[PDB]
C-alpha cells in the first residue's frame, strides 16, 4: 500500500498519467492531478480518482509551459502535503514536420513540456524527498528516448534529454532514499509484438518502481515497446 | 499467482536463482531446481522450496557445460509438466585474470555456462511455450552486460552475448505470446552510487514482475538493478 | 581536399571549434567562425585561420541564445556562399550546481546553447545541402551525451538531446547525401587512458567524418574518451 | 604511413578484411593474411597484396575454430616480426534458422569463429604490444552487435559478445599505449535508410583511421557504419 504517501502526476487527466493515478489511488495514496481539460472533464475525472483513494485527491492546472505556474503546484504540495512522495512526469505535447520546416514556436513549446517541465517539477520535489529520506521520481518518456524517427525532432530530442536528466538526478540523490527512473513505452492505445501497449500495463510498471523492492533500481530506463528497441 | 505454471531455474540451489525459485514457489508454481552442491545440500534446499509451493518441487543435476544433460532436463520437463512456462537462466561462473594470462580452459568454461547454456536451455523451452501461446524467459545477466571492467573478459563477453541473444529470441517469438528479457543486477549480497548491496529478494521481486501478465509488453530488453552503476 | 566547400563552425574562436577550423582550412575550405571574443582576439584568430585557407575565412558573432541572430548567420551564408557544405556545432556553455539549487536562468541558457542552437543552426543549413545533394553535419557533444555526472543536469540533458536530434535529422536526410553525426570527447585539455584528449585529435576525427569515405556513417556518435564510456 | 608496422588480419582472403589488408599495405605495413580458400586463390591474393607493400606479405592457414592453430600463427608473428602492431578480427561465419531448429553444431561453430577466436587472437597479441608501448586492435563486428534480428541468434550473441570483450580489453590496456575498438558495418556489398550498400573500401578507410596515431584516444568503443540502421 501507499497510505499517507502523496503522488504528483503531470498530464494525468487522460490516458497513461490517468491510468497511473488510478492505481496509486487504489493503493491509498493522495493524488494531485494536472493538465488540460474542460471543467466538466476535470470534475468527472477528479471525482473518479477521489472515489478510489482513501486519501485526498485534487487537481492543479499548472501549464507545463509556465515555469512560474509549475512552482505553484510544487509549492502548494509542500504546504498541503509536506512534499510529494512520488513524482511522475507524464505531460507531453507533439508535432510532426521535417526539421527545415519546423516552427520555432513549436520547438520551444515541445522542449518546455517534454523536457524543461520535468526539470522545474523535480527541482521542487527534491528537498522534501531528501528531508523525508525517501522518494520516487518516474519520468514517462517513450521509445524515441532511445531511438529516433523522422519528422519528430523536437520530440525525440526531448526524450533523449529526459534520459540524461534522469541519469544525473539519480546520481545526485542516490544516497537519500530517492530513485529517479524512466519508462519508455511503444505505441500505446515497428512493434514486433503486433499489439498496442495498454495504459493499464504501463501503470503496473509505474506501480512497481514505486514499491520498496525497486529501491535499488535508479538512474535507469525500462522499455515497454513489444520488441521495438530490440531491433 | 502462478498456480499450474511450471518454472525451470538454472543455478538455483543458492543466491539469486534460489531467491527467485522461492518467490515463484510462494505463488503456486511447480519448480525445477538446478545447480551445484553436495547431496546433503541439494535435498535441504529442495525441501525448503517445496515447503512453500502447493505444486511439485524437484531438482535436476544437469551440468551447464554438458548440453546433452541440459537437453535431458529440458526433455524431462516437457514430459513431466508439458514444458516450462517460465524459464530463468541464472547459472554463471567467474574467473578474474588479465587476458594474456587468462587460461583458454577458463574462457571455454565461462562461455559455456554464462552464454551457451542459455542457448541450449531456450531451444528446448521455445516449442512448448509456442504451442501454449504463452511464455516467460528471464535471463539473469549483470551490469557487465552493459559496461565492462578489467580482468573479467570471459564474464563480460558472455553477459554482452546474453544481451544479443535476448534481443534476438524476443524478435523471433514476439507474436507467440512469449517474452524474453534480461535482469542486470549490480553488486549483490550473496561503482554503486547507492552505496548499498542489492539483495536477492530485491532481484527476485523484479523477476516476479516480468513473469506476470502485466509485463507482456516488456520483451527483448534489459532492466538494470545496479543502484546507479550504469548511469555513469 | 575541401576546395569550394564552405564550413560553418559555431564556438570556433577557441579550443576544439578552433582546432577544427584550422584543419578544414589547411584543406582549402571557406570558414565562417563564430563566438565570444575580444575584438583583439577575434581579429587575431580570424587572420590566423585566413592564413591557412586558400578560400575565404570570416567571423560572425551570432549569440547562440538568440534564434533570430542565428538565422542571420544562416542567411548570410546562403547569400555569400550559397549554403554551408559542412556544419559543425561546437558552441557550449556550462554550470555546476545540484538540481534543487539550479538557477532557472542557467537551465534555459544551457539548453539554448547546448541544444536549441543546433536546431536553429541545422534547420537553416539543410535546404541548401539537400539541393546540392551533399552535406556534413557534425555535433560536438561529450561523454555526458551517453553517461551522466552529478550536478551537471542541464548540461547532461542537452548532450543527450543532441544525441536524439542527431539520430532524427540523420534519418530525415539519409537519402540526400547529407550525414548527421556526433562526437563525444572525454576530458579535453574517469579516463582509464590517464591522458587528456588534445583538440588536434578531436579535429582529426571531424576531418574524417567530413571525407567522402564517411558517407555511410550517419546518425551515429563517435566516443573519444580514452575508455571513459567503456565502463 | 605504416612502414615497419606489422598487421595481422583474420579472414582477409576476401571481402572487408582483404580491403583492409590492401589499405594497410599501401601504407607500408607488413601483412599477415589469414582465411579460407583453395590454394590457387590463396597465392593469387597474397601476391595482389604483396604487390602493394614494400614490406613482407604472407599468409597463415590458421583455422579460427582450432585455438592451437591460432596460437601458432600468433607465435610465428612474434618470432618473424616481434609481434603484431595492428590486429583486426574479421573472421566470421553465419547460419540463419529459428533457434529451436538451430543446430548445436552450428551455434558452437559461429561462437568459435565470431567470438572466441578474437579472445585467442588478442591474448597472443597483447604482450608484444605492451612491451612496445603501442598497439591497435580493431574488431570487425556488425550492426548486430548493437541491435538484433530473428534467426541470427548465434551471430547476434557473438557480435554482442565482441562488444563486451572490446570494452574489457580496452580497460585492461588503456595505460599501455594500446587501443581496442570495434567497427560495426551495416549491409556491405561483398533497414538502411541510406538505401546504399556499404563498400569494403569505405569500411577499410575507417579501419585506417583508427590505426593512425590521431585515434589514440578512441578506445573501448564501437563505430557503426550502417547508413542509419541503428539510429532507429
d(CA C195, CA C136): 29
What is the distance in angstroms between the Cα of A2 and the nearest Cα belonging to chain C? 25
Of the candidates A156, A114, A161, the one whose C-alpha atom is nearest the C-alpha of residue C169 is A156
Whether residue C93 lies within 8 A of chain A, CB to CB, comes out as: no
Residues making up chain C, counted from first to last: 231
Residue from B208, B188, B190 nearest B198 by CA? B188
What would you measure as the largest C-alpha separation in chain C, in angstroms?
51
Q: Answer yes or no: are the C-beta atoms of D116 and D139 closer than 8 Å.
A: no
C-chain residue closest to D210, CA distance? C205
Question: Closest Cα partner for C86 from C35, C21, C159, C168?
Answer: C21
Q: Cα–Cα distance between B200 and B195 in angstroms, integer?
A: 16
Distance between CA atoms of B40 and B47, rounded to whole angstroms?
A: 11
Radius of gyration, alpha carbons of chain D: 17
Pick from B148, B149, B232: CB nearest C149: B232
Residue of B nearest to A176 (CA): B194
Residues 19-38 of D with CB under 8 A from A: none
| Helix axes D153-173 and B153-173, enclosed angle (nearest 10) | 150
Partners of D231 on chain A (C-beta within 8 Å) are 147-148
As a three-state string, the secondary structure of chain B is CCCCCEEEEECCCCHHHHHHHHHHHHCCCEEEEECCCCHHHHHHHHHHHHCCCCCCEEEECCCCCCHHHHHHHHHHHHHHCCCCCEEEECCCCCCCCCHHHCCHHHHHHHHHHHHHHHHHHHHHHHHHHHHHCCEEEEEECCHHHCCCCCCCHHHHHHHHHHHHHHHHHHHHHHHHCEEEEEEEECCECCCCCCCCCECHHHHHHHHHHHHCCHHHHCCCCEEEECCCHHHC
Give CA–CA dist C144/C150, Å, rounded. 10
Placement of cell 509556465 in the chain:
A66
In terms of DSSP bridges, do strands A178-185 and A221-224 run parallel, antiparallel, or are they unpaired? parallel
Touching subunits of B (3+ CB pairs, under 8 Å) are A, C, D
Residue of C195, C200, C229 with shortest CB distance to D221? C229
> Which residue do the cell numbers 523471433 mark?
B172
Per annotation, catalytic residue among B35, B74, B138, B155: B155
**Max Cα distance, chain D (Å):** 51
Contact A230 B186 (CB under 8 A): no
D202 vs C: CB within 8 A: yes
The answer to whether D67 faces chain B, any CB pair under 8 Å, is yes
Point out the residue among B99, B104, B169 whose CB comes nearest to the CB of D122: B99
Instruction: Let me know the angle formed at the C-alpha of D173 by D167 and D177, rounded to the nearest 5 degrees.
Output: 120
Residues of B in contact with C147 (CB under 8 A): 231-232
Paired with D9 in beta bridges are D33, D88
C-alpha cell at position B64: 551447464
Q: Which residues of A touch B194 (CB under 8 A)?
A: 174-175, 216, 218
Identity of the residue in A192, A213, A218 whose CB atom sits nearest the CB atom of B205: A213
- What letter does residue C29 receive in the DSSP assignment? -
| Contact of C224 with C197, CB cutoff 8 Å | yes
Q: How many CB pairs under 8 A join B and C?
A: 10
Check if A231 contacts D (Cβ < 8 Å): yes
Q: After which residues is chain D broken (C to N over 2.5 A)?
A: 190
CA A79 to chain D, closest CA, distance in angstroms equals 45
**What superfamily would CATH give domain B1-232?**
NAD(P)-binding Rossmann-like Domain (3.40.50.720)
Please say whether the beta carbons of A104 and C88 come within 8 A. no
Cite the annotated binding site of B for substrate by residue number. 142
* CB interface of B with A, residues 122-161, below 8 Å: none
Q: Give the closest of D147, D148, D232 to A149, CB-based.
A: D232
CA dihedral A186, A191, A197, A202 (to 10 degrees): -40
Angle B44-B48-B49 (CA atoms, 0-180°, nearest 5)?
A: 125
Alpha carbon of A14 to those of A22, A140, A144, B10: distances in Å?
11, 14, 21, 43
Q: How far is CA A185 from CA A203, A209, B20, in A?
A: 11, 15, 26
Size of interface A-D (CB pairs under 8 A): 10
Contact B200, B18 (CB under 8 A): yes
Q: Is B155 a catalytic residue?
A: yes
Residues of chain B neighbouring D156 (CB-CB closer than 8 A): 164-165, 167-168
Q: Exposed (0-12), middle (13-18) or buried (19+): which is D71, by Cβ within 10 Å?
A: middle
Chains in touch with A (≥3 Cβ pairs < 8 A)? B, C, D
- Establish whether A143 is an annotated binding residue: no
**Least CB-CB distance to D123: which of B99, B161, B169?**
B99
Q: Is D14 annotated as a binding residue?
A: yes
Each as own residue / partner, the long-range contacts of residues B2-5 (CB below 8 Å, 24 or more positions apart, any chain) are B2/B27, B2/B28, B2/B29, B2/B85, B2/B86, B2/B211, B3/B27, B3/B28, B3/B29, B3/B54, B3/B55, B4/B28, B4/B55, B5/B29, B5/B30, B5/B85, B5/B86
Phi and psi angles of residue C205, each rounded to the nearest 5 degrees, phi first: -65, -45
Q: What residues have CB less than 8 Å from A23, skipping those under 6 apart?
A: A203, A204, A206, A207
For residue B70 the three cell numbers come to 541440459
Q: Is the dihedral of CA B128, B129, B133, B134 positive or negative?
A: positive
Domain A1-231 fold is Rossmann fold (3.40.50)
Question: Binding site annotation covers C42?
Answer: no
Three-state secondary structure call for residue A93: coil
- CB contact under 8 Å between C227 and D193, yes or no, is no
Q: Is there a binding annotation on residue A14? A: yes
Neighbours of C (≥3 Cβ pairs closer than 8 A)? A, B, D
Q: Which residues have C-beta within 8 Å of that of residue A129, sequence separation ≥ 6?
A: A83, A84, A85, A135, A173, A176, A177, A178
For residues D92-118, b (16+ Cβ closer than 10 Å) or e, as one string?
bbebeeebbebeeebbbbbbbbbbbbb
Q: Which residue of A has its CA nearest to C97?
A: A172
- Is A147 in contact with C167 (CB distance < 8 Å)? yes
Locate B94 and state its grid cell.
Answer: 567467474
C171 vs D219: CB contact, 8 Å cut-off?
no
Q: Looking at beta carbons, which residues of chain A come within 8 Å of D147?
A: 230-231
- The CA distance from B15 to D213, in Å, is 47
Contacts D67 to B, Cβ<8 Å: 104
Please tell me chain A's helix, strand, coil percentages from 3-state DSSP, rounded to the nearest 5. Answer: 50, 15, 35
* Cβ proximity of D149 and D156 under 8 Å: yes
The answer to whether A174 and B195 have CB atoms below 8 angstroms apart is yes
B221·A229 Cβ contact <8 A: yes
Which residues are CB-neighbours of B119 under 8 A, at least 6 positions away? B165, D99, D102, D107, D153, D154, D157
Q: Are B171 and A193 in contact (CB under 8 A)?
A: no
**D148 contacts on A by Cβ (under 8 Å):** 230-231
Q: How many residues are listed for chain A in this entry?
A: 231
Residue B35 Ramachandran class (φ > 0 left, ψ -120 to 50 alpha, else beta): left
- Chain B residues 166-185 with a CB less than 8 Å from chain D: 167-172
CB B217 within 8 A of CB C134: no
Using CB atoms, pick whichever of C148, C230, C231 lies closest to residue B231: C148
Q: Is B98 near chain D, with CB under 8 Å? A: yes
The reply to whether A203 sits in an annotated binding site is: no
Backbone angles phi, psi at C128, to 5 degrees: -65, -30
Q: From its phi and psi, is residue D55 left (phi > 0), alpha (psi between -120 and 50) or beta?
A: beta
Given a contact cutoff of 8 angstroms between Cβ atoms, the answer to whether B167 and A230 are in contact is yes
Nearest residue of chain C to residue D184 (CA atoms) = C217
Q: Does C13 count as an annotated binding residue?
A: yes
- Cβ pair C164:A160 closer than 8 A: yes
Alpha-carbon distance of A119 to D75, in angstroms, equals 58
Cell 544525473, residue located: A168
Amino acid at each position: 500500500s501507499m497510505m499517507t504517501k502523496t503522488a504528483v502526476i503531470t498530464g494525468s487527466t487522460s490516458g497513461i498519467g490517468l491510468a497511473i493515478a488510478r492505481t496509486l489511488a487504489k493503493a491509498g495514496a493522495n493524488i494531485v492531478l494536472n493538465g488540460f481539460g474542460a471543467p466538466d472533464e476535470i470534475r468527472t475525472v477528479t471525482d473518479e480518482v477521489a472515489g478510489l483513494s482513501s486519501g485526498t485527491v485534487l487537481h492543479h492546472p499548472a501549464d507545463m509551459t509556465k515555469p512560474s505556474e509549475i512552482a505553484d503546484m510544487m509549492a502548494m504540495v509542500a504546504d498541503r502535503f509536506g512534499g510529494a512522495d512520488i513524482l511522475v512526469n507524464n505531460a507531453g505535447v507533439q508535432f510532426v514536420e521535417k526539421i527545415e520546416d519546423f516552427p520555432v514556436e513549436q520547438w520551444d513549446r515541445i522542449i518546455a513540456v517534454n523536457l524543461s517541465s520535468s526539470f522545474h517539477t523535480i527541482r521542487g520535489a527534491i528537498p522534501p524527498m531528501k528531508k523525508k529520506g525517501w522518494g520516487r521520481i518516474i519520468n514517462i518518456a517513450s521509445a524515441h528516448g532511445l531511438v529516433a524517427s523522422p519528422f519528430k525532432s523536437a520530440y525525440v530530442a526531448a526524450k533523449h534529454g529526459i534520459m540524461g536528466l534522469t541519469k544525473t538526478v539519480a546520481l545526485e540523490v542516490a544516497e537519500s532514499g530517492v530513485t529517479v527512473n524512466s519508462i519508455c513505452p511503444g505505441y500505446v492505445l515497428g512493434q514486433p509484438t503486433k499489439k498496442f501497449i495498454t495504459v493499464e500495463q504501463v501503470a503496473s510498471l509505474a506501480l512497481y518502481l514505486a514499491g520498496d523492492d525497486a529501491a535499488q533500481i535508479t538512474g535507469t530506463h525500462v522499455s515497454m515497446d513489444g520488441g521495438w528497441t530490440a531491433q
